[PDB]
Amino acid sequence: IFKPEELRQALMPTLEALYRQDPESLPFRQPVDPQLLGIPDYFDIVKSPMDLSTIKRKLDTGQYQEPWQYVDDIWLMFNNAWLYNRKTSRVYKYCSKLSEVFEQEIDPVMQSLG
Ligand SMILES: COc1ccc(CCc2nc3cc(-c4c(C)noc4C)ccc3n2C[C@H](C)N2CCOCC2)cc1Cl
């Protein structure tokens, strides 16, 4: 059993560390808006959109029951970006950089919660 405040206290620093990567987090701070970006097939390819602001809101409002659900949303966000974009693209490279920041910080936190 994990209380929402316990999850917020433990996990919010890991999310904030991603936000503090600038410019790498900028594309991830807002939901992808295909109409703004001229990528009309986006929602045909990415079936379950996710972004940092959604994850933040879910942590803030206690929508995770256990911490691996938070990890799942983080990884879904990255998988969506790696899927839609080419390996040579800026957003793919930024995705990878954020994913490495996450990888390095997440286990000490998960180990403490478990
Ligand atoms: C700072 O990094 C960027 C800045 C601009 C671009 C080109 C445009 C773009 N290309 C974008 C690509 C994505 C994206 C993501 C993330 N996953 O699939 C797609 C597509 C999301 C947003 C994207 N955006 C929008 C950017 C970030 N603006 C948001 C509004 O404020 C100014 C900056 C790309 C990048 Cl990687």
CATH code for the domain of 7: 1.20.920.10
Dist CA 29 CA 10 (whole Å): 20
Centre of ligand 1 to C-alpha 1, Å, is 37
Burial class (CB in 10 A: 0-12, 13-18, 19+), 55: buried
Dist CA 42 CA 64 (whole Å): 27
Dist CA 79 CA 35 (whole Å): 21
Centre of ligand 1 to C-alpha 32, Å, is 8
Q: How was this structure determined?
A: X-ray
Which of 35, 52, 91 maximizes ligand 1 atoms within 8 Å of its Cβ, making it the mutation to test the pocket?
91
Residue 86, domain extent: 1-114
Residue 43's closest CA among 101, 94, 84, 93?
84
Which of 26, 53, 97 maximizes ligand 1 atoms within 8 Å of its Cβ, making it the mutation to test the pocket?
26
Burial class (CB in 10 A: 0-12, 13-18, 19+), 41: exposed
* Count of domains observed in the chain: 1
Resolution attained, angstroms: 1.0
Residue position matching structure tokens 């403490």: 112
Cα-flanking dihedrals φ and ψ of residue 73, to 5°? -65, -40
What residues contact 30, with CB distance under 8 A and at least 6 apart? 51, 53
